[PDB]
Each structure stands twice: as C-alpha cells, then as structure tokens.
Design a protein around this ligand. Structure first.
Ligand SMILES: Nc1nc(N)nc(O)n1
Ligand SMILES: Nc1nc(N)nc(O)n1
Ligand SMILES: [Zn+2]
Ligand SMILES: [Zn+2]
Lengths: 154, 155
C-alpha cells in the first residue's frame, strides 16, 4: 500500500524536484507530513550535503518533539541516500515513502554514461533497519526518468 | 598501514572523546589535518542527534576549503564514521580517513554490554563510500576506547 493520499504527497515532491531543476539545481524534493496530515515543512535541492531529506532531519530535530518526529512521514521524489537515511534514523523520524529508488536512479545514470556518485546507492533499510519504507511508485517512474534525464543525461 | 604520525592524531581524537564524555556527551572525537600536517579543525560530539564531529568536519571542509585542498586532507577519528558521516565525507570530496576503533568493534561491544543497538546500521565506511582510502583500527587504542565506550554505553 502506497495509498492514494501518499501519491498526492509524492506528486508534490515531484513538483518540488521540477522547481529545483528550473532554478538550476538537481531534481530532488521532499515533504515532511505530521501524523494529522498537515504539511510541516517542504524542501528541495540546493554545498554538496544540501539534500532536502537532510534539511527535513535537521528541521524535525530543531522544531519537533521526539514523540512528534516518530509519528511523522517523509515523502521524497527519490529514495534517501545513505547520509539522509542515517540522519532520518538518528533524529527518530517515522515512515518514508519514495517515488523512485536509488536502484532505478543508479541504473539510469549508468545508461547515460554519467559519473556514478561517490556514495553507494544503498537501500534505506540497509542503512536504517528499523524504518518503515514504501515505494517505488509505478505511476511516477516515467516522470522521474524524464526529470532525472534533464539534469544528468549525457 | 597506521603510521606513528597517524597514532599521534588518533591519541588526540581520543582526548577529544574524553573531553566530550566529561562534559556529558558521547565519547567521539575527530581531527581534520591538511596535506602539510597542520590541524585545520577539531571537534567532538554535541548531542540534536546528527551533531557528529565527522559531519561537522564535512560541513567545515566544504565551507572553508577548495575541492583540491579537501581531497588532500585527512580526517582522523576515535570511532569509525557512521553512514551519515561517511557519506557526507564522500559528497564533499574529503580524502583519507583513519580510525582508532571500527563500528564493528563498537557494535560487538554494545552487544556484549546488552546495550540498545543504534537506529543506524554499523556499516563499514567502504560500503557507504567505496572510493575512500581507509586505515584502522589501531590495536594500540582498543582497550582505551573499550573503556571509554563502556563508561557511556555499558555503565
Ligand atoms: N539522494 C540524493 N542524491 C543527490 N545527489 N542529491 C540529493 O539531493 N539527494
Ligand atoms: N557514529 C556515531 N555514533 C554515535 N552514536 N554518536 C556519534 O557521535 N557518532
Ligand atoms: Zn541524501
Ligand atoms: Zn556519524
């Protein structure tokens, strides 16, 4: 179950990835949602550690209680890299939903002959065993493929 | 693979881990050294749960060094980088890493003490950052770190 409600928040992550692409950044966006369904924070890509998932981790730590964090959900256009996955787990954030996996992205970068990142594309549960993780979203594969192609294709 | 010069900087990381323990933090310390041998920055734990000295060094190196100087710099650390720090180091393009104890030793020790496993897996650095040159652990500092980790996480 990627629910219909989840898809609504993933589509929004996708629009943030587009917004970042248009302002000259890498196409990645994420959205922190509280247990209620209220969007608490939103971000997108922008130094090389400026990942929206990490920004969300630092934000959740600064502005939420351990208890509220644990009940929050993070949606993301692209599965967290190991930095973000670890940060999320260290601050005690809850569920993660992603539209594309770092497996799909790594496959695609290889297809385009693009430089592999200096960080391995580990699935989240390899880095953070306790986190509940849903995705990818079959509905948004082609869109993300196209978005990633705009930035990284070659 | 661990030189005498490396050990001097690891001993210094250990004293920072001590300093952190004494001021009520987790016993972790790290030291950023430039290609010359000049210490550029030093830090230790401050738990915000992401306040890891290795990460602080990554953000610092990005803010204050050139891609070229970063690549030629060495980071020493009392305890092998967690996946967050290991990834951050690789994303900013830092150089060699030397550690006094591994996350394997630490994870073994926490299990021995019946202590709660961390919410992040103890991945070796090269699992997270394949390209980084990594030296350690240091047999000379095992018992010391064991004792120090025991103070915070066993006792
Ligand atoms: N997973 C990820 N990878 C990169 N390069 N940039 C961001 O923002 N996230
Ligand atoms: N790797 C690591 N793990 C913990 N708990 N605390 C710090 O500072 N570093
Ligand atoms: Zn990331
Ligand atoms: Zn760390």
């Amino acid at each position: 179950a990627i629910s219909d409600a989840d898809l609504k928040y993933l589509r929004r992550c996708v629009d943030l990835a587009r917004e970042a692409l248009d302002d000259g950044d890498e196409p990645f966006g994420s959205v922190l949602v509280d247990h209620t369904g209220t969007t608490l924070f939103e971000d997108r890509n922008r130094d090389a550690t400026a990942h929206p998932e990490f920004a969300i981790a630092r934000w959740a730590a600064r502005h939420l209680t351990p208890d509220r964090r644990a009940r929050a959900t993070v949606y993301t256009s692209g599965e967290h890299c190991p930095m973000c996955a670890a940060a999320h787990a260290w601050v005690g954030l809850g569920r993660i939903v992603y539209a594309t996996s770092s497996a799909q992205l790594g496959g695609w970068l290889t297809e385009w002959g693009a430089q592999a990142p200096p960080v391995a594309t580990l699935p989240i549960n390899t880095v953070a065993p306790g986190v509940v993780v849903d995705g990818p979203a079959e509905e948004l594969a082609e869109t993300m493929h196209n978005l990633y192609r705009a930035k990284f294709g070659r």
